[PDB]
Design a binder for this molecule. Structure first.
Ligand SMILES: Nc1nc2c(ncn2[C@@H]2O[C@H](COP(=O)(O)OP(=O)(O)O)[C@@H](O)[C@H]2O)c(=O)[nH]1
Length: 488
RNA sequence: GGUCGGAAACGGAGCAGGUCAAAACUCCCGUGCUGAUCAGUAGUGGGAUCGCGCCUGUGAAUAGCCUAGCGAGACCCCGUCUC
C-alpha cells in the first residue's frame, strides 16, 4: 500500500520520542492507529477489536518496571497486524515433477487473463515448465487477448475461436498438455457472478471435468462491501484454497481483503500493483508487516542476492584491487541488474528511507531507457570490451564511434555519455582498489579496521548524491545498515 | 539486438560473434637464379717419398774381419918393547 504503513509508522513514532509514556500516551497513539485502519476500509467493529486486543496484550498497570515498554508496545501491534492478515492455514505449493493444475475464478474485469500470464511467467522464470489454457467463451476477444499476452510471454497456450462449450475445450486442453508431461497447467475461466445460475453451474461442471489441484479466486482491490457476499458464496460451491489480490494501485487499497481472510481462512499468495505482466510481487506475511513498521526484510534481499549466485568472487577481487574495470564487466553488472527483478522491490525491502520512493510513472520507462545501454554496448567488439580503459582507446580512433553508431541508433551523444559514465565508474573502482584491503581472499584479515572502513565510508559518501545521504542516516546510519546486511 | 519503412505480414542498411570456390596480404612444397657451408667422394700437376703393399726388369758384383863400496874410528884378541 505504501501509504497505510507510513501513517502507522508515524503512529509508532508518536508513541516513542517522549520524555514519558503513561496510560494516556497509549490511547493517544492508538487513535492514530485506528484512524489509519478506518481509512483502509476496515470494519469499525474489527478496529475496535484490534484496539482491545493490543490493550490486553500490553497492560501498563502492573507491568514490571525496568523492562523495555516501547519495545514491547511496538511489537504488540506488529503481532496484531500480522495476525489480522494471517489466516493460520498453510498455503498450497506445487511439487516438482508432478502435473499440477490450477483453476482461476473471479468476477468480470478482475484480471484473470493477466493473472494467468503473470503466474505463468513467474514460474517460468523460477524454472518451471508451464502452459496456458483459455476456457473463455463469453467475453468477446478473450482468446485473442490471451494469445497476444502469451506470445508476449513466450508461454504455450491452447484455445479455439469456434468452440462455445468451455468444459470440453478446458478438458481437452488439459488432456493434450498432460501427454507431454507439463508441470503447471493454469486454466482461464470467464467472468461470473453469483446472481447468474447458468454460469454458476458451468463452474461446477468445469471444476468436476478438470479436477484442479488448487482453486484460486481473483479479487480486485477496488471493490467495496460486495466482496464478502460473493466470496463466501463462491467458496460454498468450489474448494477455494488461495486468493490473489490485484489492482493494488487503486484508491480502495483492498480493505475488504482482511474480512475475506477472516472469512475464508486462506492466505494471499501474490499481489499485483501494475497492469504490466512483469509487475508481480509476493505477499509473504511477516515481511509485509515488517515493511509497515520501518523494519524492512533482510532475509528476502539476501535470498534474492543468493538467487543471483555470482559464479566467482576471487578473480573479481584481485582484478578490482589492481584497478581494472572493463566494459564487459560493466555489461555483466547491467545483466545482473536486469536479472535482479523489479527495481522498486529492491529498495522497498531495505529499512531505509521508505518503500514509496520508486514512482511507477517515470522509473518504469527509466528501466527501458537503461535497457538501451546494453544495445549500445553490444556494438563493441572483444577488443573494446576487454580493454583496460575504454576512454583512452575511444579518444584515439573516432571511427569506432561511427562503427558503434552503425549497429545502434544515432548514439553520437549516447556513446559519449556512456563513456563518461564508464570513466566515472572506472575512477570509483580505482579508488575502491586503492582502499588497500577491504575485500575477502588472500590473507586472513577477516576483521576490518575502523580506520580503513572510515576512509572507505568517506570515499563512498562523497560520490553517491546529495539529499539522499542526509536522509539515509549519515555515516553511522550507513555503516549500521551495512552491518545489518552483513549479519542478515 | 537495436534502427528505418510498413495497420500487419514482411522488407533495407548493418554492428557484436562465427564461415570461406570467388577484396587484399602472407607462408609451405615444386620450379628458375644467386651465394656460403662443406668430407669414412675422382684426377694429374707438383712437393714429399729411412716405413707400406704396389706393376715391373738387367744383371757377374755386393755384404764381415784384420841395498851396497873407500879412507879414519871405541872395546876385545893375536905379536913386540919398557918399568
Ligand atoms: N491497475 C491495475 N489494473 C489491472 C491489474 N491487473 C489487471 N488490470 C486490469 O484488468 C483488465 C483486464 O481484466 P480481464 O482479464 O479482462 O478480467 P476478466 O474479464 O474477468 O478475465 C486490464 O484492462 C487491466 O487494466 C493491476 O495489477 N493493476
Amino acid at each position: 500500500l505504501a501509504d497505510l504503513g507510513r501513517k502507522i509508522t508515524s503512529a509508532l513514532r508518536s508513541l516513542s520520542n517522549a520524555t514519558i509514556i503513561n496510560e494516556e500516551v497509549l490511547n493517544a497513539m492508538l487513535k492514530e492507529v485506528c484512524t489509519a485502519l478506518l481509512e483502509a476500509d476496515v470494519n469499525i467493529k474489527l478496529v475496535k477489536q484490534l484496539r482491545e486486543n493490543v490493550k490486553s496484550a500490553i497492560d501498563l498497570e502492573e507491568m514490571a518496571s525496568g523492562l523495555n515498554k516501547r519495545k514491547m508496545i511496538q511489537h504488540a501491534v506488529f503481532k496484531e497486524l500480522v495476525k489480522l492478515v494471517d489466516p493460520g492455514v498453510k498455503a498450497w505449493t506445487p511439487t516438482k515433477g508432478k502435473q499440477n493444475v490450477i483453476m482461476f475464478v473471479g468476477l468480470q474485469g478482475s484480471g484473470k487473463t493477466t493473472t494467468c500470464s503473470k503466474l505463468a511467467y513467474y514460474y517460468q522464470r523460477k524454472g518451471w515448465k508451464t502452459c496456458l489454457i483459455c476456457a473463455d467463451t463469453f467475453r468477446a476477444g478473450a482468446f485473442d487477448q490471451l494469445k497476444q499476452n502469451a506470445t508476449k510471454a513466450r508461454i504455450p497456450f491452447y484455445g479455439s475461436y469456434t468452440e462455445m462449450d468451455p468444459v470440453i475445450i478446458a478438458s481437452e486442453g488439459v488432456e493434450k498438455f498432460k501427454n507431454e508431461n507439463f508441470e503447471i497447467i493454469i486454466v482461464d475461466t470467464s467472468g461470473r457472478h453469483k446472481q447468474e445460475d447458468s454460469l454458476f453451474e458451468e463452474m461446477l461442471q468445469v471444476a468436476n471435468a478438470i479436477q484442479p489441484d488448487n482453486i484460486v479466486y481473483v479479487m480486485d482491490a477496488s471493490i467495496g462491501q460486495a466482496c464478502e457476499a460473493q466470496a463466501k458464496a463462491f467458496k460454498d460451491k468450489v474448494d477455494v484454497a488461495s486468493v490473489i489480490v490485484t489492482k493494488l494501485d487503486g484508491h480502495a487499497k483492498g480493505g475488504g481483503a482482511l474480512s475475506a481472510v477472516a472469512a475464508t481462512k486462506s492466505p494471499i499468495i501474490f499481489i499485483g500493483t501494475g497492469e504490466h505482466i512483469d509487475d508481480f510481487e509476493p505477499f509473504k506475511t511477516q515481511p509485509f508487516i515488517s515493511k509497515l513498521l520501518g523494519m524492512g526484510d533482510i532475509e528476502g534481499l539476501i535470498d534474492k542476492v543468493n538467487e543471483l549466485k555470482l559464479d566467482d568472487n576471487e578473480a573479481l577481487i584481485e582484478k578490482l584491487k589492481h584497478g581494472q574495470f572493463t566494459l564487459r564487466d560493466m555489461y555483466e553488472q547491467f545483466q545482473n541488474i536486469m536479472k535482479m527483478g523489479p527495481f522498486s522491490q529492491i529498495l522497498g525491502m531495505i529499512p531505509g528511507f521508505g518503500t514509496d520512493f520508486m514512482s511507477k510513472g517515470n522509473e518504469q520507462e527509466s528501466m527501458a531507457r537503461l535497457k538501451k545501454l546494453m544495445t549500445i554496448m553490444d556494438s563493441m567488439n572483444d577488443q573494446e570490451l576487454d580493454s583496460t580503459d575504454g576512454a583512452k582507446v575511444f579518444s584515439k580512433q573516432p571511427g569506432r564511434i561511427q562503427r558503434v553508431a552503425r549497429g545502434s541508433g544515432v548514439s553520437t551523444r549516447d556513446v559519449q555519455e556512456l563513456l563518461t559514465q564508464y570513466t566515472k565508474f572506472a575512477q570509483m573502482v580505482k579508488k575502491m582498489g586503492g582502499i588497500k584491503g577491504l575485500f575477502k581472499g588472500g590473507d586472513m584479515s577477516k576483521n576490518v579496521s575502523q580506520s580503513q572502513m572510515a576512509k572507505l565510508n568517506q570515499q563512498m559518501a562523497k560520490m553517491m548524491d546529495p539529499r539522499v545521504l542526509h536522509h539515509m542516516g549519515g555515516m553511522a546510519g550507513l555503516q549500521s545498515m551495512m552491518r545489518q546486511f552483513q549479519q542478515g
